[PDB]
Amino acid sequence: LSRLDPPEAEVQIDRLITGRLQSLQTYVTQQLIRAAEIRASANLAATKM
Amino acid sequence: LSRLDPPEAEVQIDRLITGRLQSLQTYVTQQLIRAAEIRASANLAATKM
Amino acid sequence: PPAYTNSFTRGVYYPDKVFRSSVLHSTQDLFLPFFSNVTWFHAIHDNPVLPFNDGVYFASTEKSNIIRGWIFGTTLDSKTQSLLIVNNATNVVIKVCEFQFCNDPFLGVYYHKNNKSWMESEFRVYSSANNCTFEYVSFKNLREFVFKNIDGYFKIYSKHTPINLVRDLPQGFSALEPLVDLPIGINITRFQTLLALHAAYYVGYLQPRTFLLKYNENGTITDAVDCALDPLSETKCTLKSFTVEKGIYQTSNFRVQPTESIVRFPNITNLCPFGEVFN
Amino acid sequence: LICAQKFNGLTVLPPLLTDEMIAQYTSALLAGTI
Amino acid sequence: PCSFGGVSVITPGTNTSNQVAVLYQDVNCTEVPVAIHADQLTPTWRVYSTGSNVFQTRAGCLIGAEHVNNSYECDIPIGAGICASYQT
Amino acid sequence: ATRFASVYAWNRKRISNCVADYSVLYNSASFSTFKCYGVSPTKLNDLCFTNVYADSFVIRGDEVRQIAPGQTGKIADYNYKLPDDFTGCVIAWNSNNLDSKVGGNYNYLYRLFRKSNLKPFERDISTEIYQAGSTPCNGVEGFNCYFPLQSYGFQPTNGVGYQPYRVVVLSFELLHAPATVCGPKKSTNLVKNKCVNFNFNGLTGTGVLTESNKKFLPFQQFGRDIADTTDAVRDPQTLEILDITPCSFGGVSVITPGTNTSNQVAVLYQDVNCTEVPVAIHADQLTPTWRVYSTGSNVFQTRAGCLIGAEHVNNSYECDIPIGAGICASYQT
Amino acid sequence: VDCTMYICGDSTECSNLLLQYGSFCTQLNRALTGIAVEQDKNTQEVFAQ
Amino acid sequence: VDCTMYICGDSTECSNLLLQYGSFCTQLNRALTGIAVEQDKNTQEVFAQ
Amino acid sequence: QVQLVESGGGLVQAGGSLRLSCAAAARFSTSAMGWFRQAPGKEREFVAAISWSNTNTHYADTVKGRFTISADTAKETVDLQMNSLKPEDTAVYYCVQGGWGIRQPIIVDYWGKGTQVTVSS
Ligand SMILES: *[C@@H]1O[C@H](CO)[C@@H](O[C@@H]2O[C@H](CO)[C@@H](O)[C@H](O)[C@H]2NC(C)=O)[C@H](O)[C@H]1NC(C)=O
Ligand SMILES: *[C@@H]1O[C@H](CO)[C@@H](O[C@@H]2O[C@H](CO)[C@@H](O)[C@H](O)[C@H]2NC(C)=O)[C@H](O)[C@H]1NC(C)=O
Ligand SMILES: *[C@@H]1O[C@H](CO)[C@@H](O)[C@H](O)[C@H]1NC(C)=O
Ligand SMILES: *[C@@H]1O[C@H](CO)[C@@H](O)[C@H](O)[C@H]1NC(C)=O
Ligand SMILES: *[C@@H]1O[C@H](CO)[C@@H](O)[C@H](O)[C@H]1NC(C)=O
Ligand SMILES: *[C@@H]1O[C@H](CO)[C@@H](O)[C@H](O)[C@H]1NC(C)=O
Ligand SMILES: *[C@@H]1O[C@H](CO)[C@@H](O)[C@H](O)[C@H]1NC(C)=O
Ligand SMILES: *[C@@H]1O[C@H](CO)[C@@H](O)[C@H](O)[C@H]1NC(C)=O
Ligand SMILES: *[C@@H]1O[C@H](CO)[C@@H](O)[C@H](O)[C@H]1NC(C)=O
Ligand SMILES: *[C@@H]1O[C@H](CO)[C@@H](O)[C@H](O)[C@H]1NC(C)=O
Ligand SMILES: *[C@@H]1O[C@H](CO)[C@@H](O)[C@H](O)[C@H]1NC(C)=O
């Protein structure tokens, strides 16, 4: 923001936001898959108990 | 890369990389879901065995 | 009148020189629609020129090579080069020159002539060459041809097949292997053939259809499917398989668009107080 | 679509248990059960 | 929304027969002929887009199949409790 | 050609369906002038032309500089004119041996006064004799009554430069259509069974070329697979088919027990024959350690790939470290 | 799937540009390896009983 | 969900631009159809016993 | 008529260094370049010539070894650097574009507007 003008900064922070959002989405998808696996394991453990 | 100057080659390569990375991420997510389904099926098969 | 006959599943040509084996390839290119209409010609007891359009499919079934050349052009007014093709004595001649044409041009032939009716040297057809820009120095059989001028390239594909049949046309499949791809660079809109009389050739036109071509081990097309022919063909194209198992398959979607437009605004409206001004 | 899976970075890691080993395991299970 | 839906092809194995039927999703059997039709191969598409053997099920409009009062085991699941079969 | 046209009637011909083989005449350099404008014989490789117009005639070399666009002078405005955008090469050679003899030649006719400038692509053929309408004679060879053409003669006293030169101007045309004729390009020998960057008729790829039993068709040139990727190529030089394969790409795995037990390790290269292991970007790394595993006495070819640092043993034990394809590595014994 | 090869084909510039994006390739490779190990474990559990 | 319609609303230019992206729409439609078929199979197996 | 841009020249001190630049809308890599000088009392005389590849350098033997000519394809220009300036450099310099010829030292096809160079001691 300080080094670049508002126009160039718009695109720069837009690219940064896109990258960070993609990373966060990938992390959330991985967390959801792991949570589903953990739910299956917990159901198995509950049945065993 | 050869037929275009670096100023345009950079943006074109960025676009291609973004597209290919999105495709690979979608493929990996689909593979993870299919692997979870296959793990459930294999657990059922092991229980049957 | 000009009778129309079913084209069956003919007019298939290799889209490119690429070689494929035992794979079904979906290609979007100009092709002759399956079961189209072609003009049958008869002469018992009205000789227009068929427009070239984008691509032209020609078919001939003769046993005495009556048809031997083609002419392609747009105006034939001696202002633009006219393409001419001749096939005689196993020799192919290609010309782009400009020459005058008689009132009723037509090829002439004679039977059992020692001198062959002369004409071998005089050739009193035109005056001379002025605008030559190209040169080329070297019911028993059915000949199929496909000519298309795309992006400044004139592509001619052909296929000659000997058939032992006189009743009707054969209900078989035969791809048209390419013959030539010349860089003519001219745009054609009309074409004509040559005939001797005092006469059975079919003509068709291509459309930008999407086809599914089947390849074999030897890399030669055996069967083809036109996706737009019928719902079964579209299902085959979607599944990319000539065999469709029992079930329900989704092909595409249908949409209805507005005719032109519609705009609504208040009518009459609050007129400005121009009465006290003008009157 | 089996043997063509090697063109552009794709690789098919070999199965750890060969079909012979799985067949042997199944035969052992059958013999034990019988 | 104007008409938008989807087109499905119901057909048995190609070994049995080449006859097919069309199913347009959630549309009455009156707008099918005008849904950008009548511009395809006349002998096949223009006859499958209209004519007799027209049925209106909850799934949509089914063309090329004959409604039967009798009920049998489901063969091809059209939906909404309706199934298509080739045998008679 | 036995007969040559007049200087004012330079013979024009069209050349197409072929490429000028300047290589043969390059080393020989038989002709004394190869004046190319805006291009050089060596640099013509990076350029393609479709057709050529050859204007052959005989002129005087001293005038070559005079007859150029933009020249400031009255003389150059009445001899000949050319377009400013000219991309033609003038090949000129002396021909005094055959075009000159004892007594000279009087076969050269030129024009001094013309009606106006010569319009490009304009032809005027007529047998009528043009007579000036200002002071016509009509019965005598008087004022304003002279032959339209004037004879020009060259004598032996003229120097070599002034002697006649046979000159052919080859102008290459460029059209909106894509180029179809290009000068020959040097082709490297054919190599097989090794990674190479192959450029076949403009198709560029990387892989190993090997003999193939596939049967192509006369019109067919390239090959493809289910995934529309290049798989076979028909070499234009000779009639045969060459396959294409991914070079070596794989992966490297390190098999080792716990560091507490021992520091000995083994390397596993995925799905690659051991012959290509050392050549796989090695020999530029630590000699004492890495190159030991690059090639050694103990090498095993497993379905997984190539294993270095382990000895295959008859005895079969329970799997300890899973390698694959039924093969496992253990440090014991 | 080799992430570097798929996104970029023996291109140093493309390789560097992909490197600038982050550790997406490592995550994808780890996920694929985990899926393969999961299939291995499924087979072992089903048959090695 | 019609991928072409949702991304592009009766727009020729948007459809032309999407056609360059690839087979994302076909993959999404196939996934949705598979989900629907899985729901139907679940109902059939749970009830039609 | 071809629009060519000339930069440099002017008045320079004797014994120093001089920079000249000639730019044309046409490519310089594919066309050889040349620099010629004309002064009162003398006709056109060869000064410098560079071929397409920038490897063949030709200069008059009396002044050879002091002029360096370079061609920038990215800028599509030709630059000339002169060292050990002498009064003889006071002239008008033309930059010419054309091709290489075995017969003549350089083939001239397109001329330049020209730049006046003067040397003051
Ligand atoms: C005679 O031929 C010449 C050249 O072949 C014609 O002039 C050009 O012809 C080409 C054909 O490839 C056209 O593309 C150009 O546009 C023509 N140039 C001009 C200025 O017209 C010429 O027109 C021909 N003459 C006749 C009577 O056909
Ligand atoms: C189509 O291809 C097959 C195989 O690609 C050809 O069969 C080959 O025939 C030759 C005899 O000329 C044998 O030497 C080869 O061994 C055969 N191939 C194999 C794999 O054994 C066949 O001739 C080709 N043409 C057809 C089938 O019409
Ligand atoms: C071709 O003409 C015949 C004339 O009887 C007609 O029946 C047929 O429908 C036409 N073909 C098409 C595709 O319309
Ligand atoms: C064929 O032409 C030759 C050439 O003059 C002539 O002599 C001969 O009589 C002709 N034969 C005929 C007319 O039967
Ligand atoms: C055919 O090509 C010529 C060449 O440019 C062009 O002038 C002409 O308009 C084209 N024909 C049509 C119908 O546009
Ligand atoms: C104004 O035009 C509309 C047509 O859109 C018409 O229905 C309406 O009657 C008009 N207004 C009056 C006052 O008639
Ligand atoms: C009189 O005034 C009215 C406005 O109330 C106007 O519409 C009309 O045109 C006027 N008459 C004349 C003759 O101008
Ligand atoms: C496939 O065709 C064969 C040959 O007629 C037939 O016996 C078989 O029943 C067909 N398959 C099905 C599913 O009907
Ligand atoms: C049988 O189906 C028809 C529809 O084709 C219907 O009209 C009729 O009422 C049905 N039969 C009975 C007994 O309802
Ligand atoms: C790790 O090292 C200790 C010695 O400090 C050893 O006792 C132990 O066995 C080692 N771990 C394994 C798995 O061998
Ligand atoms: C297996 O035993 C034979 C017989 O002693 C021996 O020759 C062979 O080398 C053994 N296997 C290996 C991998 O060494």
Side-chain angles (χ1 to χ4, degrees), chain A, chain B, chain C residues 1-112 114-119 121 123-256 258-279, chain D, chain E, chain F, chain G, chain H, chain I:
Chain A
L1 285 164
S2 66
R3 188 192 299 179
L4 295 182
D5 55 357
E8 207 72 1
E10 286 271 317
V11 63
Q12 290 292 336
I13 294 89
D14 285 332
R15 200 102 65 73
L16 277 168
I17 287 162
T18 311
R20 291 181 181 178
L21 197 73
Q22 175 177 2
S23 174
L24 196 155
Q25 287 278 2
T26 310
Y27 165 80
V28 161
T29 312
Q30 278 279 28
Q31 279 291 303
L32 280 158
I33 291 155
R34 211 166 291 99
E37 184 178 1
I38 286 281
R39 186 206 315 114
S41 185
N43 282 316
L44 175 54
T47 312
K48 264 163 184 303
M49 188 175 288
Chain B
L1 187 68
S2 69
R3 279 173 56 195
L4 277 78
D5 58 350
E8 213 70 2
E10 284 277 324
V11 59
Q12 294 294 336
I13 292 158
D14 286 328
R15 198 104 65 73
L16 278 164
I17 288 162
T18 310
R20 292 181 179 178
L21 202 67
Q22 266 187 0
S23 307
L24 193 56
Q25 283 281 7
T26 309
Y27 161 75
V28 168
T29 317
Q30 279 276 25
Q31 281 291 302
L32 279 157
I33 292 156
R34 209 163 292 102
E37 192 275 330
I38 291 281
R39 189 198 323 104
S41 187
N43 280 312
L44 181 60
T47 311
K48 262 159 191 299
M49 187 74 75
Chain C
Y4 300 152
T5 302
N6 204 4
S7 65
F8 302 125
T9 67
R10 290 189 171 287
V12 174
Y13 61 89
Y14 300 86
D16 48 3
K17 305 180 184 70
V18 175
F19 161 83
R20 311 191 167 76
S21 57
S22 305
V23 67
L24 316 177
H25 185 51
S26 178
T27 179
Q28 192 274 325
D29 197 74
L30 312 188
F31 286 112
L32 193 81
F34 274 29
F35 307 103
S36 176
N37 268 355
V38 287
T39 56
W40 207 354
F41 278 91
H42 290 272
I44 48 173
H45 313 89
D46 305 322
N47 49 3
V49 181
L50 284 76
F52 179 79
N53 302 327
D54 305 330
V56 72
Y57 166 83
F58 196 97
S60 62
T61 179
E62 287 296 334
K63 61 184 160 190
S64 56
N65 68 22
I66 51 173
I67 297 159
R68 295 178 190 177
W70 294 282
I71 293 165
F72 300 78
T74 178
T75 53
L76 292 79
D77 58 355
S78 190
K79 304 188 181 62
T80 177
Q81 282 78 358
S82 196
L83 192 148
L84 187 148
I85 306 180
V86 162
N87 173 26
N88 60 343
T90 70
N91 298 344
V92 192
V93 165
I94 309 292
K95 296 176 72 158
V96 299
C97 313
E98 292 176 358
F99 40 90
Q100 194 68 70
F101 314 93
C102 292
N103 195 0
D104 186 12
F106 66 89
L107 197 65
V109 71
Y110 202 88
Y111 299 161
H112 206 270
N114 57 332
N115 276 6
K116 188 47 56 177
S117 64
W118 305 65
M119 192 172 177
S121 60
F123 206 85
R124 52 177 75 169
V125 177
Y126 59 86
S127 61
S128 58
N130 308 124
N131 222 244
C132 289
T133 66
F134 194 90
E135 182 59 23
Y136 175 60
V137 190
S138 307
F139 300 161
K140 184 52 54 55
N141 43 51
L142 192 148
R143 305 156 181 75
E144 310 189 17
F145 311 82
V146 166
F147 321 125
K148 57 192 216 166
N149 210 340
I150 313 181
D151 69 272
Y153 272 105
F154 205 56
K155 325 192 189 300
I156 295 89
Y157 315 80
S158 308
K159 157 60 82 172
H160 175 288
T161 177
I163 55 169
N164 274 272
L165 183 58
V166 57
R167 298 294 91 197
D168 303 318
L169 289 82
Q171 286 270 41
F173 197 101
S174 294
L176 267 56
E177 63 189 21
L179 282 194
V180 295
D181 192 310
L182 312 176
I184 310 310
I186 302 162
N187 37 17
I188 300 293
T189 57
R190 275 153 51 172
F191 85 103
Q192 195 186 133
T193 176
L194 304 167
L195 183 62
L197 266 169
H198 306 283
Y201 70 95
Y202 315 88
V203 171
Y205 306 128
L206 315 181
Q207 275 79 10
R209 285 275 198 285
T210 304
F211 270 48
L212 190 73
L213 308 159
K214 171 167 186 180
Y215 288 97
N216 66 339
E217 280 73 355
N218 309 139
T220 180
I221 296 163
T222 57
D223 287 346
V225 166
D226 189 2
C227 310
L229 168 56
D230 70 332
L232 182 59
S233 305
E234 195 173 327
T235 300
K236 286 173 177 174
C237 285
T238 290
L239 305 179
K240 291 175 80 71
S241 164
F242 278 30
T243 298
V244 186
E245 194 56 33
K246 181 195 284 289
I248 184 168
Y249 312 88
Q250 172 158 4
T251 61
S252 176
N253 296 319
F254 64 99
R255 191 75 167 289
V256 175
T259 51
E260 70 298 2
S261 158
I262 284 296
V263 174
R264 181 52 35 88
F265 277 110
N267 179 5
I268 307 303
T269 68
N270 177 265
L271 302 169
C272 305
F274 285 11
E276 66 93 10
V277 169
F278 292 84
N279 191 342
Chain D
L1 295 175
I2 299 91
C3 280
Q5 292 146 4
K6 158 169 202 55
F7 277 119
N8 190 358
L10 307 192
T11 187
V12 176
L13 295 174
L16 186 154
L17 286 174
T18 57
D19 302 75
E20 284 76 359
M21 290 181 182
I22 297 158
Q24 200 169 347
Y25 272 133
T26 54
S27 173
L29 284 157
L30 265 70
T33 317
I34 290 155
Chain E
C2 309
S3 47
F4 83 101
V7 193
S8 306
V9 179
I10 296 148
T11 183
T14 51
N15 326 13
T16 306
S17 176
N18 287 262
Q19 204 165 352
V20 307
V22 189
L23 166 55
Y24 300 83
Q25 302 278 18
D26 56 42
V27 287
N28 304 129
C29 292
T30 62
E31 293 83 3
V32 297
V34 58
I36 199 64
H37 292 98
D39 317 298
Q40 300 90 39
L41 275 295
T42 62
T44 60
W45 284 98
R46 184 175 293 171
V47 299
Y48 273 121
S49 188
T50 187
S52 178
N53 316 123
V54 168
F55 191 58
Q56 185 66 46
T57 182
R58 200 265 194 289
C61 185
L62 187 73
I63 303 95
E66 189 189 2
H67 193 41
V68 169
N69 302 67
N70 307 328
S71 57
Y72 319 87
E73 285 77 356
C74 178
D75 197 9
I76 300 161
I78 285 161
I82 301 290
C83 291
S85 184
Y86 184 71
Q87 78 94 26
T88 60
Chain F
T2 59
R3 289 185 61 73
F4 265 64
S6 281
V7 70
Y8 90 102
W10 41 269
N11 180 20
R12 172 147 266 190
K13 186 174 177 69
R14 198 180 158 287
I15 312 301
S16 297
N17 305 309
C18 59
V19 72
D21 185 68
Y22 83 106
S23 56
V24 64
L25 61 92
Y26 182 64
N27 57 49
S28 178
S30 59
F31 305 147
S32 308
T33 315
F34 287 128
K35 281 165 180 227
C36 277
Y37 302 167
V39 70
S40 282
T42 54
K43 211 198 176 55
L44 72 87
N45 183 3
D46 299 331
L47 189 52
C48 287
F49 289 105
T50 187
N51 303 303
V52 188
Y53 301 73
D55 310 332
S56 52
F57 43 90
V58 191
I59 53 167
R60 196 173 83 185
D62 280 312
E63 312 301 340
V64 300
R65 191 181 290 186
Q66 281 73 350
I67 299 287
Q71 207 282 336
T72 53
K74 296 291 189 182
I75 303 301
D77 300 330
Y78 294 85
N79 302 134
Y80 197 73
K81 187 63 170 181
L82 287 160
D84 301 357
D85 190 2
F86 191 60
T87 60
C89 285
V90 186
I91 301 160
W93 58 98
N94 180 21
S95 69
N96 171 278
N97 55 333
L98 304 178
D99 301 333
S100 200
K101 70 183 194 69
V102 181
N105 284 307
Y106 314 93
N107 65 323
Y108 285 112
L109 321 172
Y110 73 99
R111 265 192 284 89
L112 190 59
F113 299 90
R114 218 183 92 80
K115 273 75 72 168
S116 176
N117 289 329
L118 267 167
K119 209 267 185 183
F121 311 140
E122 193 275 341
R123 208 166 55 183
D124 47 336
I125 314 179
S126 58
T127 52
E128 206 278 330
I129 294 154
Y130 181 82
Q131 304 155 14
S134 64
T135 313
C137 316
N138 312 97
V140 298
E141 191 274 330
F143 209 76
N144 298 129
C145 292
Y146 309 90
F147 204 69
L149 316 170
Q150 293 81 6
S151 183
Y152 211 69
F154 306 85
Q155 46 181 359
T157 57
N158 278 8
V160 175
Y162 290 85
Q163 287 289 357
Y165 274 74
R166 277 163 60 184
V167 184
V168 177
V169 180
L170 303 178
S171 297
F172 305 162
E173 69 177 1
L174 289 171
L175 301 170
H176 301 265
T180 79
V181 181
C182 303
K185 284 149 277 292
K186 300 294 105 183
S187 65
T188 62
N189 202 12
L190 191 153
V191 297
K192 311 175 193 166
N193 318 90
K194 53 179 76 178
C195 178
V196 287
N197 190 350
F198 55 90
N199 186 358
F200 277 98
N201 299 308
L203 173 76
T204 69
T206 306
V208 174
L209 318 180
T210 70
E211 286 287 358
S212 67
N213 60 336
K214 290 190 172 189
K215 310 309 302 186
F216 269 40
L217 300 182
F219 68 97
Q220 300 170 334
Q221 278 187 348
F222 300 164
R224 279 191 192 279
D225 63 336
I226 312 310
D228 73 7
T229 58
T230 310
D231 192 20
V233 163
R234 187 197 271 291
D235 50 347
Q237 197 191 352
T238 178
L239 278 295
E240 60 181 341
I241 308 94
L242 310 157
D243 291 339
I244 286 152
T245 306
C247 318
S248 66
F249 82 102
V252 189
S253 303
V254 173
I255 293 145
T256 183
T259 49
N260 329 13
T261 311
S262 176
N263 286 263
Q264 209 163 347
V265 303
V267 190
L268 165 55
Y269 299 82
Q270 300 274 21
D271 53 50
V272 285
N273 300 130
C274 303
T275 61
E276 293 82 2
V277 164
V279 66
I281 196 64
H282 304 329
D284 312 287
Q285 56 185 356
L286 276 295
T287 46
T289 61
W290 281 96
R291 296 194 211 189
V292 176
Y293 307 96
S294 73
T295 297
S297 178
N298 61 6
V299 176
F300 187 23
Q301 191 68 55
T302 311
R303 271 290 310 288
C306 184
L307 193 72
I308 298 97
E311 188 191 1
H312 192 211
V313 174
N314 290 121
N315 306 329
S316 61
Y317 292 165
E318 65 188 15
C319 181
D320 197 1
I321 309 175
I323 286 161
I327 305 303
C328 296
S330 186
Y331 183 68
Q332 78 96 36
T333 56
Chain G
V1 186
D2 196 353
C3 172
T4 308
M5 291 296 292
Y6 183 86
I7 302 300
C8 305
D10 60 87
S11 286
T12 56
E13 297 89 343
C14 187
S15 302
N16 302 345
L17 274 45
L18 171 56
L19 278 166
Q20 292 170 338
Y21 266 69
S23 182
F24 279 113
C25 289
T26 318
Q27 274 187 114
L28 301 153
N29 289 119
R30 191 193 329 286
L32 293 167
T33 306
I35 297 162
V37 173
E38 189 65 28
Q39 276 81 242
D40 187 4
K41 187 187 169 293
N42 295 334
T43 311
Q44 184 70 2
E45 183 64 26
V46 167
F47 284 112
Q49 286 196 354
Chain H
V1 182
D2 186 5
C3 172
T4 60
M5 187 181 288
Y6 176 83
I7 304 298
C8 309
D10 59 83
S11 187
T12 301
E13 302 86 345
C14 178
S15 302
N16 298 345
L17 302 203
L18 189 139
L19 280 166
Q20 284 172 331
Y21 269 61
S23 172
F24 280 115
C25 286
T26 315
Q27 288 296 127
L28 303 158
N29 290 121
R30 195 200 325 284
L32 294 171
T33 307
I35 288 160
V37 169
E38 189 69 2
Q39 297 310 281
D40 279 318
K41 199 185 82 68
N42 295 337
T43 310
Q44 182 69 4
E45 68 184 1
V46 69
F47 277 116
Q49 282 189 347
Chain I
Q1 185 60 45
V2 189
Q3 182 183 355
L4 306 196
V5 189
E6 290 86 338
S7 297
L11 177 61
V12 62
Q13 301 294 333
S17 298
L18 184 61
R19 328 289 174 204
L20 315 181
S21 296
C22 174
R27 289 185 164 182
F28 270 21
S29 60
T30 63
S31 310
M33 305 305 310
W35 284 86
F36 281 83
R37 82 186 185 184
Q38 69 275 16
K42 287 278 197 177
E43 304 183 6
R44 302 185 297 191
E45 51 171 355
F46 185 78
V47 187
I50 191 75
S51 67
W52 64 274
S53 59
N54 307 338
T55 60
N56 304 77
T57 46
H58 307 263
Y59 319 104
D61 295 331
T62 61
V63 297
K64 179 167 180 180
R66 310 182 299 96
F67 293 2
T68 58
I69 182 162
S70 59
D72 205 327
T73 71
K75 309 171 175 175
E76 314 185 341
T77 61
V78 63
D79 193 72
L80 184 65
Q81 317 270 287
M82 299 181 184
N83 302 327
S84 306
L85 288 159
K86 300 186 179 178
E88 278 73 356
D89 308 342
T90 299
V92 177
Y93 277 69
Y94 277 31
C95 60
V96 287
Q97 180 189 353
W100 164 245
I102 200 169
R103 176 185 173 178
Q104 303 190 143
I106 175 167
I107 311 309
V108 188
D109 305 319
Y110 301 102
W111 288 88
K113 294 181 182 181
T115 175
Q116 186 79 40
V117 173
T118 313
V119 177
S120 54
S121 61

